[PDB]
Amino acid sequence: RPTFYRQELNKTIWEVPERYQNLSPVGSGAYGSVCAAFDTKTGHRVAVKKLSRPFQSIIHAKRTYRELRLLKHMKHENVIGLLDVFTPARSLEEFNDVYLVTHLMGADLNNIVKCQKLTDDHVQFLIYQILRGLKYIHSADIIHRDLKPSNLAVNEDCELKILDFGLARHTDDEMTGYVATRWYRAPEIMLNWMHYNQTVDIWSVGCIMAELLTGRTLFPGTDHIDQLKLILRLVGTPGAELLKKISSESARNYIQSLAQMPKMNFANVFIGANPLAVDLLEKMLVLDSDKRITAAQALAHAYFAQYHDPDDEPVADPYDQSFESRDLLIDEWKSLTYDEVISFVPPP
Numbered sequence: 001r002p003t004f005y006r007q008e009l010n011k012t013i014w015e016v017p018e019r020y021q022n023l024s025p026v027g028s029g030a031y032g033s034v035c036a037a038f039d040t041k042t043g044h045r046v047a048v049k050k051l052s053r054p055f056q057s058i059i060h061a062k063r064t065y066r067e068l069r070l071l072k073h074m075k076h077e078n079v080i081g082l083l084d085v086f087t088p089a090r091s092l093e094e095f096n097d098v099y100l101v102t103h104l105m106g107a108d109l110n111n112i113v114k115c116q117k118l119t120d121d122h123v124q125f126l127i128y129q130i131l132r133g134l135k136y137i138h139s140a141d142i143i144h145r146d147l148k149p150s151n152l153a154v155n156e157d158c159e160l161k162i163l164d165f166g167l168a169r170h171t172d173d174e175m176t177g178y179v180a181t182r183w184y185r186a187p188e189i190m191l192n193w194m195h196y197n198q199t200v201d202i203w204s205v206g207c208i209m210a211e212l213l214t215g216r217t218l219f220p221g222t223d224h225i226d227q228l229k230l231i232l233r234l235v236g237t238p239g240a241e242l243l244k245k246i247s248s249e250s251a252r253n254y255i256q257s258l259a260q261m262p263k264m265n266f267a268n269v270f271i272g273a274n275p276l277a278v279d280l281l282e283k284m285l286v287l288d289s290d291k292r293i294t295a296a297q298a299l300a301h302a303y304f305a306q307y308h309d310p311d312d313e314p315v316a317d318p319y320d321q322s323f324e325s326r327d328l329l330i331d332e333w334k335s336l337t338y339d340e341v342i343s344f345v346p347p348p
């Protein structure tokens with residue numbers, strides 16, 4: 001067991017191993033608090049997150065367990081990994097607080113998409129990295145659900161990592177109105193059309209790729225209905241084949257109230273873009289999720305010929321998510337989480 005020290009950081013008592021120095025607040029909210037620190041063991045600048053009320057209800061205890069399980073699994077160059085997890089508790093009986101440690105991220109995609117002038121070569125390398133990470137995430141049967149520029153960390157050398165695993169499900173209020181939290185969502189999950197699957201993430205990658213090419217949000221809807229009208233004007237209204245797959249009768253009825261529209265010519269929307277980029281956007285932004293390109297198929301598309309290496313695009317170890325259908329008490333989720341804290345092995 002390392003030695004711990006205590007300090008008060010903006011209203012909060014932090015108790016952390018001596019290896020972590022120069023703690024300074026960076027973020028706060030319902031979920032808890034984040035501090036930047038220097039890790040003397042590794043030489044890395046790190047983010048240390050102290051969870052708030054990790055075991056306060058069945059829903060919160062299960063959420064805590066889910067985040068720790070996901071962060072412990074993800075071992076890929078283009079995905080968030082866990083550097084450390086700790087508790088000052090010396091037994092299950094005194095266990096209350098959980099702290100998570102990862103690499104300190106500076107800029108997100110927004111910080112470079114809004115400001116920098118991006119070459120076609122920059123768009124190739126950024127989208128290649130997102131798809132390389134997604135091939136890994138999807139091989140473990142994990143669905144991200146929330147890919148968007150603020151969830152993509154990018155460094156001075158244009159190297160990218162995917163963020164946001166096991167946090168609180170987004171609220172109805174958070175998805176209302178003129179909000180970036182909805183603009184990247186696949187229509188079938190935005191409107192609850194059907195049981196969704198991993199193909200939702202490929203819609204989001206298409207929305208990100210269009211915005212890097214134009215500098216403009218692809219579907220900046222003022223509300224769910226305005227956003228659907230923007231989507232259908234570009235990709236066309238659904239045909240009989242997709243309408244049958246909308247399990248919701250009310251959603252099927254509303255779609256059929258809209259005048260039919262053909263798919264638009266993407267070379268006339270994305271004026272001047274690399275023809276290979278235009279071709280890839282046509283294969284991602286397909287209304288029927290069954291017909292979208294997969295991450296593994298997209299890596300082999302000619303747009304990425306300069307970066308693609310089928311011997312350096314790895315898949316994940318199997319991920320057992322049977323806990324997701326399990327009904328347990330608060331203390332049972334707390335005991336499972338404690339076992340995962342004490343069993344942690346740090347990266348080489």
Ligand SMILES: NC(=O)COc1ccccc1
Nearest residue numbers: 047049100101102164165
């Ligand atoms: N769960 C996430 O995606 C982010 O989690 C962390 C964020 C900061 C420090 C540690 C963990």
Ligand SMILES: [Cl-]
Nearest residue numbers: 002017018019
């Ligand atoms: Cl230490």
Ligand SMILES: [Cl-]
Nearest residue numbers: 079080081103
């Ligand atoms: Cl990482």
Ligand SMILES: [Cl-]
Nearest residue numbers: 089095096097
């Ligand atoms: Cl504790």
Ligand SMILES: [Cl-]
Nearest residue numbers: 148149150180
């Ligand atoms: Cl965003």
Ligand SMILES: [Cl-]
Nearest residue numbers: 318319320321
């Ligand atoms: Cl597993």
Ligand SMILES: [Mg+2]
Nearest residue numbers: 146164167170
């Ligand atoms: Mg999110």
